[PDB]
């Protein structure tokens, strides 16, 4: 709240609005925390938010899944076992055991 | 889930669910404090409104989401929509292994194939290319295959012809109406970013060339390959399901060729002479001796299957022109010469294909249709047809009639 | 009429598609109606073989397995 | 009357404005 | 004839002389905004006017008033160029002087103190570019003019459809510019109803009561009075002899001692004549006729003081007695006629629930705001605030004018709110139309259609800002402390600023300037829209308004409209059209007095043109300008016929004025079907510029005007001689007559160089003049993209042959020779803007450092030490433009990955690679790099170098100005010194700086040297301040978004030529898609051996009726002939005499044309340059409807040496044999639209996926898959394909499991599917189960 | 209209004839663009009932 208040007088007095480090000197704290404080203060945006064309296209429809795993990778996982498991049978029985252990 | 710039975004249900919890919890608290009736009553009503807004919003006040005028979407609105459900309604889910681009002609194609851009086929068949590359041992493992096609090494092009060969692709246009809006073709690798489409099918798709775009789909499962080949294939639907007339009927350029081919003027080079057979008829025309249209008797061999499942043969001297004589070389077997002896307008040229199907069956009709297209375009090009300003003749009596 | 006759469909999952979703779900949920699939529209939603064409062999063979033992 | 809307009226069974009686 | 006309002149066919030349095409856009922002000492539209409305603002009753003095516009923070790169808005500060007066408590009003607060800042309002565009965020945007229903009253029908009983209805609607709607309407029972806005219907009379009108005055206002006298006994009556028309006698009618008519004889012209001439005032009537007659006023019994009958009540034979014995002599009744004057209003009162003013006021307030309890002050207050409040209601001037005009009043200007006289008057007129006298208007007429524009619209939004701040302003002056706060602490910025920002930023009328092409631009800035706020919607209207109207002539173009969802909802402005004084559309006309055609122009609005009889643009007059024929085709009122010699009041100015700039550029338009003509002018706007700006070989004559009026070119400010010519700049030395006395001067034009457009095309200017060439004011200095020598070239004309070629042209397909791509003429240059953002994440900050895990030196070659690609390094797909890395720590890898790093010994970094790399397949050269940095983060090495570089480059530019400028100034000082003390050789010896000392003898020349001194020293300082400011703008840390530390924008210049799949079309509506690119060997060639560039299919010509494309071809061939011919005699070097002779012959062409020509031109130096420019072809001008004719075309072909048929014999380049029949060959102008094949093409195997529902979604620009629809599903259902359909909606898309289980099988070599359940349906289960509905999957 | 188009495309059309021709074109395009929607709606109802 204190931040909103300062920008008001300083809004027309400066004629534009105070720079990101301006309210920083006005405020007690380390003054770089303004950026941090400014982030968490924002309210999240509705994922159902209509965007472009109004075509029921909604913001949430454009948010991709980053925690999934693409098959072009998953394919290489199933392969890498067959690779390393084969190459460990080419060694002595203790080297496979010692390498599988470490 | 987070977004760029460190801001967050969330579904409207949360705003709704949160509310229902708070109010509910508050009521629970308000029970242990022994509040007056007028309050706990008001709190219950407030809870009732919140649950209703959660389930289906808009049946009371249409509660609005925080800081945003637009009413928050409730659980009933997630199912509901336009129309009914969003899931199956147009449209209708995005699908992998697909693509699209501007389409062009490709008259050289047989009716069962289509021109496919090199890059499109590369990105589309990517898993097949990977698997075939390591089936023959050109790539150590699947990863190395990825780097290979990403490097576009010269060796990969031959491997693609293998996975492409017998493997139909589905072609679709934007306004799908009848079942012919999607048809299967055999891919033909083509340099360039444009899709080439057999002209005879351009009628079935109702696809002009004014910049219309078409979509490609890859039939992954084995059952889809055989479904595509035995059902959705181009050659297996030549006839409209709406009416038995062939929909593969030659369209415009081809038919202007055949009209100009079998036609006759009054006086032209070679008029009146006689030739042993259609073979030496072409020899007369191509050498420049005889005009395409001149009245001539030539020996022809026609066929009639009028025996019991058995083809009879008959030969005669037919009175015809040079163009009609040359064209007979294409007509397979049991069709009579009467069918090609006319002027061959667009109307006659369709009933030709129809009779050919109802007599010789499917296979002979397909290969027949191809030849008709090829010869139509070719001879139409020879004809040198054009349109000038002096080609439009105004009546001399117009001013008087007015 | 065509638009009126299409209204009545045994499968409620089919009706919930092109009709008003809310009313269909309610009106069906009270009676405990049990949708047996058997149709096209519903089978497309659930994502299995269409009970026609290539799939007609499958569904037929399954339909007889039902109400048996 | 006639046209595409005429088809829709037919398939919709709609009773005409001033019908006859049988 | 001008100087750039001496370079090339276009041969102009056509007869009709041009009396008026095309005005500035950007007029509307520029003029409008010019009226808005300006200091106007009066109520004319502008910031001044919008201020005077809401001002002065006084507090609530407190006698603390704040008034408004004046405003000013501060200098722009950034100029147009600087504002675009950074991304801010191009705007000026609004500084407004305010005066705060405070009245003494409680006093006769006088001020204790008044503090005049100097210019409190509120908002920055955007500014319009010299070309009429706005920059909102670094992006040029245009605000389209709007077409809406003009304010006033309008009487409509709504016949037919209502109630299906016929009978029609008649309704009136009062639509103010601001404030609530007042609607009046009838019903099938002829009861008048009223509704405010679209709200509940209410009985009309309730408003008169709200105006404080009792029933007695309602009957007295709308009805006449039938006077009844009780004289002797039983009812005599006053008779107006006209009242008996259209009615039959009700009793024995006799007066004046003579019985004129008995009972049952209808009253015709006979009865009325007798009574009028015999002067019969009073007759005796029976007591039963009043059984139906409604008593007019109230009548009470004097004795009992009780009400005998209320007003508007039907009298009876018994009622007359009870009011008769009370001593009542007079009873007033209504005059009612079911034909002339209807008893309508009377029946409305019986449905009126109210009685008095408060009752009506209550019922109105409860109508508008129902459910809430009515209050006396509330009902009174609301009704006074609706139509009577100066704040919430205005019709403004145009509304009042049309209001008064439609009511047949005198005053054209009046109050801006509604008055009791106004509402009452409208009702009377509506009733008059229902009575059969008078007619109804129509919404579609262009006199009732008003045109707004940027200036007016911005004023409305700014008005909204002042009202939403007004509530605030009164609120603060409520509690204010005395002389501490000032008219600053109260008024904020954001409230006013957000009103104007919300408009330009996201308003339906504010949109991206369509800029790939000058015609697209200029046709956007002239555009009309009935959509947006205050307009209709696509779904609501309505074929009547979309359709072309007779009033569209000369105002709106009939043939230029979109062919999409909204047809006729846009149109475009005509060529000569102008916005009327009141805001209507008026067009130029020529006043024809008596029988002579006079050249005085007169602008007539839509209603003005109505009564006059107007002649036709094509008519034949001569000498004094008398109509040759005794009768000529004309249109007078809504219809066209032959009109007599002297009747006609006016005549059309030009043959073009019906169409628009777009349609006016199609040659031989009169020969093309309107459908294909639309498409032509629709597609002509999509033509991408070309590499070599060519010229149209066949043309109209507008292209010169279109080129200049659009800002793409550079026009001479003042005439003179060019001092310096560079591909960068142009310096002109001014002529003395045009030069200002002080400061001397030269005009320096800084040319735009290669840069990105909105559509990702290239916009680049080239100098069209040579060192030391005379140019006069209004001469073309430099061409823009797609402009040639001052004309408009949107493409390149080429040799085309019509003939089927082996099916490669099948539908519209185009077969293009290899010659075209080799000449690189149809090549196009695209400039794409790619960005790299270094953001801040919760895991840590992102580095632009060049250290990227797991990449070789070949990757890092093209990058500098800092990680940014060098300028000029040519790149292809996959190369790294900007190295970027984002922190992700402690990956927590797995056993086999851990062994892998162990064997090959790589330290897997704590940083992940985000670097921006060139998208797959697109390839170009890096022409630029920008680095924006947050203020306070240290600029890296490269970032500092660029800024330092910009400093040096900036300093050089300003210095260049000063050097040429100083010489230009000192060169004038040299000349004035020579006048009176001339020393030529002596003066230029000593240092030039040491000149300012020499004075002069008494004369004005002493004061002239004085003048140049003053302005000189200013330059020293103007340069200084300009240099300083420029330097600071470089060094200032650029402001970024929250969370973004720095941004690197790379500009790639891709050169794409042409390949199969691109769309191409002529101006005549013939589209095409290049099919094959054929070798020159296979191209049809003529006997002379010159191949043909393009082979078109003739079959497209007959079906789609566009015949101009053929004429354009024919004439084109002829044009090229004159070129080839000249090309031979110039390569022959005959001489100027022989050449000159031949050229003159061409420009005459046999008789009666308007072109004129030489040998006024200097016979040697001027003529020879012209011939060199014609050798490519001879430019010809075909006016729109005045264009050339067959005979002239055939005649020009004779001079060409080419056949009359326009067809020749061609030989196939393959077999070499001839082609039967002649074929048409010629030169067609052809455009390359940007639908280019390597944009549209997309393919995806396995991409990203949407989170909410797992479905293919492009995040990398490897675009999500094609959308498979319901109709497409049916297509699969008709075929027997079950498995294709399952795989389509399950494994290929929606199944989060099945997709991976499949992919693994595809590489394994097993084609199968393990389908599972699509995740879409699996979510629907949870949503249903989330409700109280239990949905289970039963059985097995 | 009781005054037909007396000219044709091989000759020129004057101002009036073209202006009168415009309505036919625009109404043609509009009708088809609407008839496009009508067709689709029809197929919808039809395939739904079968
Ligand atoms: C703020 O305005 C927006 C929405 C208003 O909402 C809404 C409801 O009110 C509208 C108004 C008031 C219009 O005057 C309008 C319009 O004039 C137009 C199209 C139809 N456009 N087409 C759409 C694309 N398509 C493939 C071809 C046909 C529209 O839909 C609208 C439109 C609306 O729909 N068309 C044309 O004028 C012609 C024939 C050519 C246009 C040229 C270019 C292409 C456009 O100007 C591009 C540069 C943008 O300018 C628009 C996209 C605007 O978007 C933005 C971001 O700037 C849009 C008008
Ligand atoms: Mg076609
Ligand atoms: Mg098309």
PDB file of C-alpha atoms in Angstrom, chain B residues 192-261:
ATOM      1  CA  UNK B 192       9.311 -27.815 -53.478  1.00  0.00           C
ATOM      2  CA  UNK B 193       6.883 -26.794 -50.751  1.00  0.00           C
ATOM      3  CA  UNK B 194       3.626 -27.259 -52.735  1.00  0.00           C
ATOM      4  CA  UNK B 195       1.312 -30.294 -52.775  1.00  0.00           C
ATOM      5  CA  UNK B 196       0.503 -31.755 -56.209  1.00  0.00           C
ATOM      6  CA  UNK B 197      -2.992 -33.214 -56.693  1.00  0.00           C
ATOM      7  CA  UNK B 198      -4.267 -35.340 -59.592  1.00  0.00           C
ATOM      8  CA  UNK B 199      -6.502 -33.101 -61.771  1.00  0.00           C
ATOM      9  CA  UNK B 200      -9.339 -35.612 -62.096  1.00  0.00           C
ATOM     10  CA  UNK B 201      -9.860 -35.497 -58.333  1.00  0.00           C
ATOM     11  CA  UNK B 202     -10.041 -31.685 -58.261  1.00  0.00           C
ATOM     12  CA  UNK B 203     -13.738 -32.032 -59.083  1.00  0.00           C
ATOM     13  CA  UNK B 204     -14.508 -34.347 -56.164  1.00  0.00           C
ATOM     14  CA  UNK B 205     -12.845 -32.028 -53.656  1.00  0.00           C
ATOM     15  CA  UNK B 206     -14.421 -28.952 -55.260  1.00  0.00           C
ATOM     16  CA  UNK B 207     -10.932 -27.517 -54.940  1.00  0.00           C
ATOM     17  CA  UNK B 208     -10.023 -24.634 -57.162  1.00  0.00           C
ATOM     18  CA  UNK B 209      -6.394 -23.423 -57.387  1.00  0.00           C
ATOM     19  CA  UNK B 210      -7.029 -19.828 -56.344  1.00  0.00           C
ATOM     20  CA  UNK B 211      -4.803 -20.455 -53.297  1.00  0.00           C
ATOM     21  CA  UNK B 212      -6.855 -23.101 -51.500  1.00  0.00           C
ATOM     22  CA  UNK B 213      -4.889 -25.237 -49.007  1.00  0.00           C
ATOM     23  CA  UNK B 214      -5.082 -28.966 -48.212  1.00  0.00           C
ATOM     24  CA  UNK B 215      -4.137 -31.088 -45.183  1.00  0.00           C
ATOM     25  CA  UNK B 216      -2.201 -34.378 -45.004  1.00  0.00           C
ATOM     26  CA  UNK B 217      -2.654 -37.204 -42.466  1.00  0.00           C
ATOM     27  CA  UNK B 218      -0.414 -40.255 -42.004  1.00  0.00           C
ATOM     28  CA  UNK B 219      -2.180 -43.636 -41.481  1.00  0.00           C
ATOM     29  CA  UNK B 220      -0.056 -45.064 -38.648  1.00  0.00           C
ATOM     30  CA  UNK B 221      -1.524 -48.435 -37.609  1.00  0.00           C
ATOM     31  CA  UNK B 222      -1.462 -51.342 -40.062  1.00  0.00           C
ATOM     32  CA  UNK B 223      -5.263 -51.476 -40.041  1.00  0.00           C
ATOM     33  CA  UNK B 224      -5.278 -47.836 -41.132  1.00  0.00           C
ATOM     34  CA  UNK B 225      -3.032 -48.590 -44.101  1.00  0.00           C
ATOM     35  CA  UNK B 226      -5.373 -51.322 -45.313  1.00  0.00           C
ATOM     36  CA  UNK B 227      -8.428 -49.202 -44.545  1.00  0.00           C
ATOM     37  CA  UNK B 228      -6.919 -46.355 -46.547  1.00  0.00           C
ATOM     38  CA  UNK B 229      -5.941 -48.654 -49.411  1.00  0.00           C
ATOM     39  CA  UNK B 230      -9.167 -50.673 -49.617  1.00  0.00           C
ATOM     40  CA  UNK B 231     -11.671 -47.911 -48.763  1.00  0.00           C
ATOM     41  CA  UNK B 232     -10.398 -44.337 -48.858  1.00  0.00           C
ATOM     42  CA  UNK B 233      -8.100 -44.955 -51.827  1.00  0.00           C
ATOM     43  CA  UNK B 234      -8.621 -42.722 -54.839  1.00  0.00           C
ATOM     44  CA  UNK B 235      -9.076 -45.554 -57.342  1.00  0.00           C
ATOM     45  CA  UNK B 236     -11.692 -47.323 -55.232  1.00  0.00           C
ATOM     46  CA  UNK B 237     -14.082 -44.371 -55.298  1.00  0.00           C
ATOM     47  CA  UNK B 238     -14.571 -43.150 -58.861  1.00  0.00           C
ATOM     48  CA  UNK B 239     -18.355 -42.810 -58.547  1.00  0.00           C
ATOM     49  CA  UNK B 240     -20.415 -40.431 -56.458  1.00  0.00           C
ATOM     50  CA  UNK B 241     -22.329 -42.231 -53.687  1.00  0.00           C
ATOM     51  CA  UNK B 242     -25.097 -39.679 -54.275  1.00  0.00           C
ATOM     52  CA  UNK B 243     -25.723 -40.917 -57.822  1.00  0.00           C
ATOM     53  CA  UNK B 244     -24.001 -43.618 -59.820  1.00  0.00           C
ATOM     54  CA  UNK B 245     -22.467 -41.241 -62.343  1.00  0.00           C
ATOM     55  CA  UNK B 246     -18.646 -41.104 -62.238  1.00  0.00           C
ATOM     56  CA  UNK B 247     -17.303 -38.133 -60.297  1.00  0.00           C
ATOM     57  CA  UNK B 248     -13.810 -38.577 -61.831  1.00  0.00           C
ATOM     58  CA  UNK B 249     -15.262 -37.285 -65.121  1.00  0.00           C
ATOM     59  CA  UNK B 250     -12.659 -35.169 -66.965  1.00  0.00           C
ATOM     60  CA  UNK B 251     -13.201 -31.556 -66.057  1.00  0.00           C
ATOM     61  CA  UNK B 252     -12.321 -28.777 -68.485  1.00  0.00           C
ATOM     62  CA  UNK B 253      -8.893 -28.493 -70.148  1.00  0.00           C
ATOM     63  CA  UNK B 254      -8.832 -32.221 -70.874  1.00  0.00           C
ATOM     64  CA  UNK B 255     -12.302 -32.218 -72.433  1.00  0.00           C
ATOM     65  CA  UNK B 256     -11.576 -29.223 -74.657  1.00  0.00           C
ATOM     66  CA  UNK B 257      -8.718 -31.289 -76.044  1.00  0.00           C
ATOM     67  CA  UNK B 258     -10.874 -34.307 -76.833  1.00  0.00           C
ATOM     68  CA  UNK B 259     -13.576 -32.092 -78.284  1.00  0.00           C
ATOM     69  CA  UNK B 260     -11.015 -30.449 -80.553  1.00  0.00           C
ATOM     70  CA  UNK B 261      -9.598 -33.944 -81.229  1.00  0.00           C
TER      71      UNK B 261
END
